[PDB]
Amino acid sequence: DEIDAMALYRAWQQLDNGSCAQIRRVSEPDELRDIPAFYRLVQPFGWENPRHQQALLRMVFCLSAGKNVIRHQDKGISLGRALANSGRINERRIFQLIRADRTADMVQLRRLLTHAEPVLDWPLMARMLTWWGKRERQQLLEDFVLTTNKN
Amino acid sequence: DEIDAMALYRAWQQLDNGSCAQIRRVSEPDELRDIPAFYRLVQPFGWENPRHQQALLRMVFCLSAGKNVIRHQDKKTGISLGRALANSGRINERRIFQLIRADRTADMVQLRRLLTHAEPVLDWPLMARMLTWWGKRERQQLLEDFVLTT
Amino acid sequence: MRSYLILRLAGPMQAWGQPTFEGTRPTGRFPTRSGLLGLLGACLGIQRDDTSSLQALSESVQFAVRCDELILDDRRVSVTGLRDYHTVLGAREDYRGLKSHETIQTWREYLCDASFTVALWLTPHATMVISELEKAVLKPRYTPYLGRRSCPLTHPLFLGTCQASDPQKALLNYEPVGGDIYSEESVTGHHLKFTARDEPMITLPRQFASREWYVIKGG
Amino acid sequence: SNFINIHVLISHSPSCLNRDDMNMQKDAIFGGKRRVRISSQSLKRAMRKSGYYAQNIGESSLRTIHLAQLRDVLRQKLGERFDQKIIDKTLALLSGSADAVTPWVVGEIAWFCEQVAKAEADNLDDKKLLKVLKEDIAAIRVNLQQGVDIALSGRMATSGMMTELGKVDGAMSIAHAITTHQVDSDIDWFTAVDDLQEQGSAHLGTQEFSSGVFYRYANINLAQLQENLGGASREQALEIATHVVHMLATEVPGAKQRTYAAFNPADMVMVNFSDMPLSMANAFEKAVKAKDGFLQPSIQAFNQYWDRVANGYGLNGAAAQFSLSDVDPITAQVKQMPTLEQLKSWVRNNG
Amino acid sequence: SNFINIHVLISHSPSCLNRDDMNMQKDAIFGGKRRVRISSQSLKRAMRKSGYYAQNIGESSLRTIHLAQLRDVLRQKLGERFDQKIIDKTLALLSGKSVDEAEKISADAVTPWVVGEIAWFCEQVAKAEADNLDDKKLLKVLKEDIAAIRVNLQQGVDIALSGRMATSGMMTELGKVDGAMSIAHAITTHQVDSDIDWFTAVDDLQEQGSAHLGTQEFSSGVFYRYANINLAQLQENLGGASREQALEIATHVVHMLATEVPGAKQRTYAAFNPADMVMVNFSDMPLSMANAFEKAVKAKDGFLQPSIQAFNQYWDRVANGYGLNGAAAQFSLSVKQMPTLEQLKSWVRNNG
DNA sequence: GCTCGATGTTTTATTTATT
DNA sequence: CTGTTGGCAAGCCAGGATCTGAACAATACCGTCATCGAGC
């Protein structure tokens, strides 16, 4: 019972310019529940199932930073290692992500993605966005601090 | 392969006031995962390798008791932790029992409290090995050292 | 070359006897000759009073035992010993009547993590054929066990059959190789001997005469 | 097949169901790790002295053995060593159309025949013979009214049996019960408070105790059971076997039970037929690690083990598995049972 | 049915109701996870010393090893019924110890005594030496009829429920009682990592800091109490009581097991919580439900709801699998639905 | 057929470490 | 039927001391050799 992350990535990359343009326009993830093209995208990924649908909200909202923002690589590079590898993010901003409340965290993450334009392993990040909670924030900070401090 | 415990000791010793102050206010070992200064401290000592992770959590907690609470003193085996705690003459035996009988995370809290009280003089790499393993044998040994010394 | 029958004696606990007339029931390191004759005798339908076929089996079969170290996850597990405090309530006070003791005590030794591979062949003037012994160990009439009835088998008694020069080569055909072999037949480059008193005096029920294994070490 | 294999996984709450001369939990090293143990003798006694056993095995129908009906086969069997005078005299003084006969009966009666023959040779009889052999006769009589108990469990500790043929092994064999996992036992530091002592208690002590998921194994020699029941049928033997299954699934030693009360039933019972009886204890040679309990991983490990080795070990043959859990099942070669009773009936009908 | 099975699910707020040699909470490994434990002896003594027990069942026995103090007590209590000599000799016959005027006379071990039972016994001793009957023959005669002595156990029911042994004296032959009931240690249905209380004792003559700094282990818990009464044995141990009396006693055991909680650290933690769930069941042979919690109950809007649910599910699995159909009543509050504990108690009183 | 009681014999080795 | 791109994301400096960590009482008993002849 897991969302095929790579399939969703491909679905987004192949999606018509119009629909994805409609999706990027959203300001916060909940607003995605008012866009038709959204459902049209996340329908073959079990949007009917609630847990899957919160997960999907986050995943799509991160995928809507741009279409060439998140260059999916493949072993795997975590989000922390990626944002650290960009060299464009300072630690205080990562803190400003992991301390942010509901919805706001996703916005800050979107801005961080636009800013860093990270090369990462997407399915890993998808798993992270699914269990978005104290453990993933923690390991995010861990990866970021380590990768930064090695340089 | 094995954690350079003295290097970690000196590292902790010449750490800036800030990072140190951040590591100190932790209230249980796992919380050290929230402090960036911790990662920057233990990264050269093999943190990105899991076994080392657990060991280092214990070590850095015990050190987080304070910069001047664990006095390293070279070998003339060397002063074991139990011996040190007894040598302080401040620690009641019953507390040592309660320590060696305790369970995970609680044991480290109680140990840090004991260390804070005794301010022990000991062979630090030795205690570091002990913390690395920390099986039931090590805890019994702690208790028996403490008893034989008094 | 002669025909061999290869057996496997594995299970959590085993018990192979040493001389005793007491509540203490001791165990050896490897299966005893009388114990093996008893295992076979149990596979066949031999009753305890059938001294004839008992003696026929005793004079038809010779053995070779190899001690197999248990390897688990690439790590070796040594054979340990076990002492069982075995009490008996209402045990017979005498050999006739119905008078009994409230409680009596015994102490019985077992082998833990032990497993053996037995090589079996026929004496020059044997009565039976390894075929029917094979049939026996494949379809036993009495319940077979490893010394004591409370010791089940975790691996089928039958391991295989083959032909060969000496028992050591026959046993070489079957993993795990390297265990020490105690055989009733010598073997060229080996001269060690292991004295024991487990040759069942049959004409004298439950008695035991002396004999000697040929000890052959493994590499 | 001739053998019935009975495998049981049963989980016990904190208790001390079997100890040694130091009041320490019985254990055993398996796969290099310590398992808590319940000795074979304790388990088998727990069965043999149980009320269920007494009702279904003790008060059985084939219980009583009538020396009368056994006259002819005895007359030939012993007829080669004794003549009919001594045989009939013996039979009649013991008692005061059968096909076959239980071997221990033949043996003990033969001994009695030796005794009465030597009684006639020396010139003697009357209450002399009936006082020399009073206790012996009493014994053989009490045993003659317990045929099923003797066939299944073997002769009692104090039986009265006198011949090599009167060394009656039970038909059932019970292995020691061992836990499927490593166990470091707990300690209970208890006090005994005196109602007449102001300061402190009157006694202090410790008691070792532990939980544990146990693996009981037992097998039944059907042929030997029939033969020890005077040539009974396979079906009757299967009824007895049914009872053995029930007891091995429900009976628990009474040791320390008044105070720890581990009255737990089996969570899994499997029965399978084979020509060679095998224990599935090697399913737990690598000690089972706990994942949401020790029970589910134990059953799972049992199933996986069976699936792996059953074919090669020649365990092909009838096999049924009653279970309370919903863990992924065995190979489809094993017939699943939803109630214990359906399993027992599966056993009654020869599998 | 012969067996009365009592199951209790009871939640306790933070507390420390049972500790060991080092004042730490008693625990027990179950299903690979640590459970907090309340020992069975603690529960039994908590019950037998309760006000409810005193009002409804009677006087708890007198458990002691100090035979001198006991001598004095009996003299003070059985003085106007017997002469001191007889009392002394009776104690000396039951204990196997010489009862003189020593300051300290110690028995073989801590042993439960019933004052009434002792009274009956010294009646027998009086009538024994009066008829010039020595001690051995007296032992034989008394050995011929034990039921009477067990009616003297009607005067000390906790001995009839929990049992008694003696290694010395005539008690060895006459006082051997196998407990009627049977009871398990209370273990939590979930894993517990015990909290630690860092406390200080403030000195009113010490301005600087505190006079004591210490730690105290404690925790919250959803405990599973189990206890079955053997019944026929309860009738035997009471001298041949009726089934009604045994059923009523069992009812009291249900009430207590449902409501009584050890007083340990309750003056500073006060976990005076009643059982949220109680279930009683008649059966042919004992059945514990602890394996409902072999897999530790994971929290879900509390530990209590998933515990009760798990209990019910396992109960159904067992009942369906083993085909158990003994009468059963559950009282719940969160097989029967028992709006009140009282209805469940009367239901038990009336043989189910 | 027992339970009773006196009775054949014989014991002591230590005492501060570190996977 | 059709939805875009570039360019850019900061630095300084700072995390404390005082003083304190308990006592008492209690750790069981039985049986798991044998003999003989006597009284019962």
PDB file of N, CA and C (backbone and C1' of nucleotides) in Angstrom, chain B residues 9 12 29 55-72 79-92 95-96 99 106-124 126-128 130-131 134 142 146, chain E residues 198 215, chain G residues 20-21:
ATOM      1  N   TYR B   9      37.336  13.551  23.729  1.00  0.00           N
ATOM      2  CA  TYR B   9      37.443  14.220  25.019  1.00  0.00           C
ATOM      3  C   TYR B   9      38.023  15.621  24.867  1.00  0.00           C
ATOM      4  N   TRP B  12      35.570  17.852  22.865  1.00  0.00           N
ATOM      5  CA  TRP B  12      34.571  18.385  23.777  1.00  0.00           C
ATOM      6  C   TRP B  12      35.167  19.452  24.688  1.00  0.00           C
ATOM      7  N   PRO B  29      19.583  11.289  25.954  1.00  0.00           N
ATOM      8  CA  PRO B  29      20.536  11.079  24.855  1.00  0.00           C
ATOM      9  C   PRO B  29      19.985  11.327  23.450  1.00  0.00           C
ATOM     10  N   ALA B  55      27.039   4.299  20.344  1.00  0.00           N
ATOM     11  CA  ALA B  55      28.152   4.500  21.277  1.00  0.00           C
ATOM     12  C   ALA B  55      28.364   5.987  21.597  1.00  0.00           C
ATOM     13  N   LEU B  56      28.387   6.790  20.539  1.00  0.00           N
ATOM     14  CA  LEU B  56      28.645   8.221  20.622  1.00  0.00           C
ATOM     15  C   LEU B  56      27.526   8.967  21.326  1.00  0.00           C
ATOM     16  N   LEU B  57      26.293   8.499  21.169  1.00  0.00           N
ATOM     17  CA  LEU B  57      25.191   9.098  21.908  1.00  0.00           C
ATOM     18  C   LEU B  57      25.464   8.964  23.397  1.00  0.00           C
ATOM     19  N   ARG B  58      25.799   7.748  23.828  1.00  0.00           N
ATOM     20  CA  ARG B  58      26.096   7.560  25.256  1.00  0.00           C
ATOM     21  C   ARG B  58      27.268   8.428  25.735  1.00  0.00           C
ATOM     22  N   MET B  59      28.397   8.314  25.034  1.00  0.00           N
ATOM     23  CA  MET B  59      29.596   9.078  25.377  1.00  0.00           C
ATOM     24  C   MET B  59      29.332  10.578  25.507  1.00  0.00           C
ATOM     25  N   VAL B  60      28.744  11.162  24.467  1.00  0.00           N
ATOM     26  CA  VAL B  60      28.507  12.600  24.427  1.00  0.00           C
ATOM     27  C   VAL B  60      27.475  13.038  25.463  1.00  0.00           C
ATOM     28  N   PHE B  61      26.554  12.157  25.842  1.00  0.00           N
ATOM     29  CA  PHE B  61      25.659  12.485  26.955  1.00  0.00           C
ATOM     30  C   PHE B  61      26.456  12.639  28.259  1.00  0.00           C
ATOM     31  N   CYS B  62      27.205  11.583  28.576  1.00  0.00           N
ATOM     32  CA  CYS B  62      28.041  11.584  29.775  1.00  0.00           C
ATOM     33  C   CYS B  62      28.974  12.794  29.821  1.00  0.00           C
ATOM     34  N   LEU B  63      29.527  13.173  28.674  1.00  0.00           N
ATOM     35  CA  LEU B  63      30.356  14.370  28.606  1.00  0.00           C
ATOM     36  C   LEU B  63      29.512  15.629  28.770  1.00  0.00           C
ATOM     37  N   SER B  64      28.268  15.567  28.304  1.00  0.00           N
ATOM     38  CA  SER B  64      27.362  16.713  28.332  1.00  0.00           C
ATOM     39  C   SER B  64      26.988  17.051  29.754  1.00  0.00           C
ATOM     40  N   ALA B  65      27.301  16.144  30.672  1.00  0.00           N
ATOM     41  CA  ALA B  65      27.235  16.490  32.096  1.00  0.00           C
ATOM     42  C   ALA B  65      27.981  17.793  32.437  1.00  0.00           C
ATOM     43  N   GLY B  66      28.994  18.134  31.645  1.00  0.00           N
ATOM     44  CA  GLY B  66      29.760  19.350  31.858  1.00  0.00           C
ATOM     45  C   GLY B  66      31.196  19.192  31.395  1.00  0.00           C
ATOM     46  N   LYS B  67      31.878  20.307  31.156  1.00  0.00           N
ATOM     47  CA  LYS B  67      33.265  20.260  30.701  1.00  0.00           C
ATOM     48  C   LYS B  67      34.215  19.800  31.803  1.00  0.00           C
ATOM     49  N   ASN B  68      33.883  20.124  33.047  1.00  0.00           N
ATOM     50  CA  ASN B  68      34.785  19.867  34.161  1.00  0.00           C
ATOM     51  C   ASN B  68      34.275  18.836  35.165  1.00  0.00           C
ATOM     52  N   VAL B  69      33.447  17.897  34.719  1.00  0.00           N
ATOM     53  CA  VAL B  69      32.912  16.891  35.636  1.00  0.00           C
ATOM     54  C   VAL B  69      33.634  15.554  35.518  1.00  0.00           C
ATOM     55  N   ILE B  70      34.059  15.200  34.312  1.00  0.00           N
ATOM     56  CA  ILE B  70      34.829  13.980  34.117  1.00  0.00           C
ATOM     57  C   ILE B  70      36.304  14.313  33.919  1.00  0.00           C
ATOM     58  N   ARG B  71      37.094  14.109  34.964  1.00  0.00           N
ATOM     59  CA  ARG B  71      38.523  14.358  34.883  1.00  0.00           C
ATOM     60  C   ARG B  71      39.258  13.130  34.376  1.00  0.00           C
ATOM     61  N   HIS B  72      39.741  13.191  33.144  1.00  0.00           N
ATOM     62  CA  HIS B  72      40.578  12.124  32.629  1.00  0.00           C
ATOM     63  C   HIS B  72      41.914  12.129  33.352  1.00  0.00           C
ATOM     64  N   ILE B  79      41.809   3.820  36.270  1.00  0.00           N
ATOM     65  CA  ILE B  79      40.667   3.975  37.163  1.00  0.00           C
ATOM     66  C   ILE B  79      39.338   3.775  36.437  1.00  0.00           C
ATOM     67  N   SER B  80      38.677   2.660  36.726  1.00  0.00           N
ATOM     68  CA  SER B  80      37.365   2.375  36.159  1.00  0.00           C
ATOM     69  C   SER B  80      36.304   3.277  36.771  1.00  0.00           C
ATOM     70  N   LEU B  81      35.180   3.421  36.079  1.00  0.00           N
ATOM     71  CA  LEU B  81      34.109   4.317  36.509  1.00  0.00           C
ATOM     72  C   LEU B  81      33.559   3.982  37.894  1.00  0.00           C
ATOM     73  N   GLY B  82      33.386   2.697  38.178  1.00  0.00           N
ATOM     74  CA  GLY B  82      32.911   2.275  39.483  1.00  0.00           C
ATOM     75  C   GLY B  82      33.871   2.714  40.568  1.00  0.00           C
ATOM     76  N   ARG B  83      35.149   2.420  40.348  1.00  0.00           N
ATOM     77  CA  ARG B  83      36.208   2.838  41.253  1.00  0.00           C
ATOM     78  C   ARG B  83      36.181   4.337  41.479  1.00  0.00           C
ATOM     79  N   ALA B  84      35.997   5.098  40.407  1.00  0.00           N
ATOM     80  CA  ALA B  84      35.980   6.553  40.494  1.00  0.00           C
ATOM     81  C   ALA B  84      34.815   7.043  41.347  1.00  0.00           C
ATOM     82  N   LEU B  85      33.634   6.503  41.065  1.00  0.00           N
ATOM     83  CA  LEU B  85      32.427   6.860  41.796  1.00  0.00           C
ATOM     84  C   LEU B  85      32.585   6.563  43.279  1.00  0.00           C
ATOM     85  N   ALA B  86      33.230   5.447  43.597  1.00  0.00           N
ATOM     86  CA  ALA B  86      33.488   5.120  44.993  1.00  0.00           C
ATOM     87  C   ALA B  86      34.509   6.082  45.595  1.00  0.00           C
ATOM     88  N   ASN B  87      35.562   6.368  44.835  1.00  0.00           N
ATOM     89  CA  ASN B  87      36.645   7.238  45.278  1.00  0.00           C
ATOM     90  C   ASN B  87      36.153   8.624  45.650  1.00  0.00           C
ATOM     91  N   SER B  88      35.139   9.105  44.940  1.00  0.00           N
ATOM     92  CA  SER B  88      34.558  10.403  45.264  1.00  0.00           C
ATOM     93  C   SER B  88      34.052  10.412  46.700  1.00  0.00           C
ATOM     94  N   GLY B  89      33.481   9.292  47.124  1.00  0.00           N
ATOM     95  CA  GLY B  89      32.994   9.149  48.483  1.00  0.00           C
ATOM     96  C   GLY B  89      31.698   9.895  48.717  1.00  0.00           C
ATOM     97  N   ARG B  90      31.085  10.356  47.633  1.00  0.00           N
ATOM     98  CA  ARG B  90      29.845  11.112  47.717  1.00  0.00           C
ATOM     99  C   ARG B  90      28.628  10.247  47.407  1.00  0.00           C
ATOM    100  N   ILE B  91      28.848   9.166  46.671  1.00  0.00           N
ATOM    101  CA  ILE B  91      27.747   8.371  46.146  1.00  0.00           C
ATOM    102  C   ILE B  91      27.340   7.225  47.060  1.00  0.00           C
ATOM    103  N   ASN B  92      26.055   7.180  47.395  1.00  0.00           N
ATOM    104  CA  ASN B  92      25.498   6.069  48.154  1.00  0.00           C
ATOM    105  C   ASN B  92      25.424   4.819  47.287  1.00  0.00           C
ATOM    106  N   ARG B  95      22.159   3.998  45.233  1.00  0.00           N
ATOM    107  CA  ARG B  95      22.020   4.714  43.973  1.00  0.00           C
ATOM    108  C   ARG B  95      22.722   3.972  42.845  1.00  0.00           C
ATOM    109  N   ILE B  96      23.836   3.321  43.163  1.00  0.00           N
ATOM    110  CA  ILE B  96      24.557   2.531  42.172  1.00  0.00           C
ATOM    111  C   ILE B  96      23.721   1.318  41.785  1.00  0.00           C
ATOM    112  N   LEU B  99      21.059   2.473  39.527  1.00  0.00           N
ATOM    113  CA  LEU B  99      21.628   2.748  38.214  1.00  0.00           C
ATOM    114  C   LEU B  99      21.782   1.472  37.399  1.00  0.00           C
ATOM    115  N   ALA B 106      16.890   5.718  30.733  1.00  0.00           N
ATOM    116  CA  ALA B 106      16.843   6.046  32.154  1.00  0.00           C
ATOM    117  C   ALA B 106      18.217   5.851  32.785  1.00  0.00           C
ATOM    118  N   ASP B 107      18.892   4.781  32.380  1.00  0.00           N
ATOM    119  CA  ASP B 107      20.225   4.481  32.881  1.00  0.00           C
ATOM    120  C   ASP B 107      21.201   5.620  32.597  1.00  0.00           C
ATOM    121  N   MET B 108      21.089   6.223  31.419  1.00  0.00           N
ATOM    122  CA  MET B 108      21.991   7.302  31.038  1.00  0.00           C
ATOM    123  C   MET B 108      21.695   8.577  31.816  1.00  0.00           C
ATOM    124  N   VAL B 109      20.423   8.814  32.101  1.00  0.00           N
ATOM    125  CA  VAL B 109      20.048   9.974  32.890  1.00  0.00           C
ATOM    126  C   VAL B 109      20.601   9.835  34.301  1.00  0.00           C
ATOM    127  N   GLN B 110      20.359   8.675  34.905  1.00  0.00           N
ATOM    128  CA  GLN B 110      20.834   8.413  36.259  1.00  0.00           C
ATOM    129  C   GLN B 110      22.354   8.441  36.327  1.00  0.00           C
ATOM    130  N   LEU B 111      23.000   7.931  35.285  1.00  0.00           N
ATOM    131  CA  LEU B 111      24.453   7.941  35.232  1.00  0.00           C
ATOM    132  C   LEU B 111      24.958   9.364  35.177  1.00  0.00           C
ATOM    133  N   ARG B 112      24.324  10.200  34.361  1.00  0.00           N
ATOM    134  CA  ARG B 112      24.751  11.589  34.250  1.00  0.00           C
ATOM    135  C   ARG B 112      24.559  12.317  35.576  1.00  0.00           C
ATOM    136  N   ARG B 113      23.499  11.973  36.301  1.00  0.00           N
ATOM    137  CA  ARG B 113      23.268  12.560  37.620  1.00  0.00           C
ATOM    138  C   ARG B 113      24.357  12.142  38.603  1.00  0.00           C
ATOM    139  N   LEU B 114      24.708  10.861  38.564  1.00  0.00           N
ATOM    140  CA  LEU B 114      25.794  10.350  39.389  1.00  0.00           C
ATOM    141  C   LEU B 114      27.105  11.060  39.072  1.00  0.00           C
ATOM    142  N   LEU B 115      27.437  11.161  37.788  1.00  0.00           N
ATOM    143  CA  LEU B 115      28.648  11.843  37.343  1.00  0.00           C
ATOM    144  C   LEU B 115      28.670  13.284  37.824  1.00  0.00           C
ATOM    145  N   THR B 116      27.523  13.946  37.743  1.00  0.00           N
ATOM    146  CA  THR B 116      27.403  15.316  38.217  1.00  0.00           C
ATOM    147  C   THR B 116      27.706  15.400  39.706  1.00  0.00           C
ATOM    148  N   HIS B 117      27.248  14.408  40.466  1.00  0.00           N
ATOM    149  CA  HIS B 117      27.480  14.411  41.912  1.00  0.00           C
ATOM    150  C   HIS B 117      28.929  14.101  42.285  1.00  0.00           C
ATOM    151  N   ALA B 118      29.476  13.037  41.711  1.00  0.00           N
ATOM    152  CA  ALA B 118      30.788  12.534  42.097  1.00  0.00           C
ATOM    153  C   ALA B 118      31.938  13.362  41.534  1.00  0.00           C
ATOM    154  N   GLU B 119      31.759  13.862  40.316  1.00  0.00           N
ATOM    155  CA  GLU B 119      32.827  14.528  39.578  1.00  0.00           C
ATOM    156  C   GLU B 119      34.056  13.633  39.556  1.00  0.00           C
ATOM    157  N   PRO B 120      33.924  12.456  38.925  1.00  0.00           N
ATOM    158  CA  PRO B 120      34.904  11.374  39.048  1.00  0.00           C
ATOM    159  C   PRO B 120      36.202  11.611  38.286  1.00  0.00           C
ATOM    160  N   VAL B 121      37.301  11.133  38.855  1.00  0.00           N
ATOM    161  CA  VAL B 121      38.574  11.102  38.156  1.00  0.00           C
ATOM    162  C   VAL B 121      38.792   9.690  37.643  1.00  0.00           C
ATOM    163  N   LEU B 122      38.871   9.534  36.328  1.00  0.00           N
ATOM    164  CA  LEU B 122      38.937   8.201  35.750  1.00  0.00           C
ATOM    165  C   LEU B 122      39.654   8.148  34.408  1.00  0.00           C
ATOM    166  N   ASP B 123      40.017   6.936  34.005  1.00  0.00           N
ATOM    167  CA  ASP B 123      40.536   6.673  32.673  1.00  0.00           C
ATOM    168  C   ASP B 123      39.382   6.775  31.680  1.00  0.00           C
ATOM    169  N   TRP B 124      39.340   7.863  30.918  1.00  0.00           N
ATOM    170  CA  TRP B 124      38.195   8.130  30.050  1.00  0.00           C
ATOM    171  C   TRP B 124      38.026   7.161  28.871  1.00  0.00           C
ATOM    172  N   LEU B 126      38.655   4.134  28.895  1.00  0.00           N
ATOM    173  CA  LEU B 126      38.162   2.923  29.534  1.00  0.00           C
ATOM    174  C   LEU B 126      36.646   2.990  29.674  1.00  0.00           C
ATOM    175  N   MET B 127      36.184   4.061  30.310  1.00  0.00           N
ATOM    176  CA  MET B 127      34.759   4.324  30.457  1.00  0.00           C
ATOM    177  C   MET B 127      34.080   4.414  29.097  1.00  0.00           C
ATOM    178  N   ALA B 128      34.833   4.850  28.098  1.00  0.00           N
ATOM    179  CA  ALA B 128      34.316   4.958  26.746  1.00  0.00           C
ATOM    180  C   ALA B 128      34.068   3.580  26.162  1.00  0.00           C
ATOM    181  N   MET B 130      33.459   0.938  28.017  1.00  0.00           N
ATOM    182  CA  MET B 130      32.312   0.489  28.797  1.00  0.00           C
ATOM    183  C   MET B 130      30.998   0.988  28.204  1.00  0.00           C
ATOM    184  N   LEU B 131      30.942   2.278  27.892  1.00  0.00           N
ATOM    185  CA  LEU B 131      29.749   2.877  27.306  1.00  0.00           C
ATOM    186  C   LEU B 131      29.484   2.331  25.912  1.00  0.00           C
ATOM    187  N   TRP B 134      28.261  -1.641  27.210  1.00  0.00           N
ATOM    188  CA  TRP B 134      27.166  -1.419  28.154  1.00  0.00           C
ATOM    189  C   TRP B 134      26.153  -2.562  28.155  1.00  0.00           C
ATOM    190  N   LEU B 142      30.403  -2.574  37.081  1.00  0.00           N
ATOM    191  CA  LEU B 142      30.301  -1.249  37.685  1.00  0.00           C
ATOM    192  C   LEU B 142      29.988  -1.371  39.171  1.00  0.00           C
ATOM    193  N   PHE B 146      32.561  -0.644  42.396  1.00  0.00           N
ATOM    194  CA  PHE B 146      32.110   0.312  43.398  1.00  0.00           C
ATOM    195  C   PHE B 146      32.120  -0.291  44.803  1.00  0.00           C
TER     196      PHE B 146
ATOM    197  N   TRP E 198      12.234  13.335  40.109  1.00  0.00           N
ATOM    198  CA  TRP E 198      13.363  13.986  40.761  1.00  0.00           C
ATOM    199  C   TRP E 198      12.859  14.961  41.813  1.00  0.00           C
ATOM    200  N   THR E 215      15.550  10.406  43.646  1.00  0.00           N
ATOM    201  CA  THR E 215      14.710   9.963  42.540  1.00  0.00           C
ATOM    202  C   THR E 215      13.740   8.869  42.975  1.00  0.00           C
TER     203      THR E 215
ATOM    204  P    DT G  20      27.250  21.359  49.302  1.00  0.00           P
ATOM    205  O5'  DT G  20      25.894  20.536  49.437  1.00  0.00           O
ATOM    206  C5'  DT G  20      25.050  20.740  50.554  1.00  0.00           C
ATOM    207  C4'  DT G  20      23.683  20.149  50.292  1.00  0.00           C
ATOM    208  C3'  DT G  20      23.700  18.723  49.774  1.00  0.00           C
ATOM    209  O3'  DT G  20      23.666  17.821  50.870  1.00  0.00           O
ATOM    210  C1'  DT G  20      22.128  20.092  48.563  1.00  0.00           C
ATOM    211  P    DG G  21      24.377  16.387  50.772  1.00  0.00           P
ATOM    212  O5'  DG G  21      23.385  15.523  49.871  1.00  0.00           O
ATOM    213  C5'  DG G  21      22.132  15.132  50.384  1.00  0.00           C
ATOM    214  C4'  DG G  21      21.501  14.087  49.492  1.00  0.00           C
ATOM    215  C3'  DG G  21      22.250  12.750  49.426  1.00  0.00           C
ATOM    216  O3'  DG G  21      21.337  11.675  49.644  1.00  0.00           O
ATOM    217  C1'  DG G  21      21.767  13.536  47.263  1.00  0.00           C
TER     218       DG G  21
END
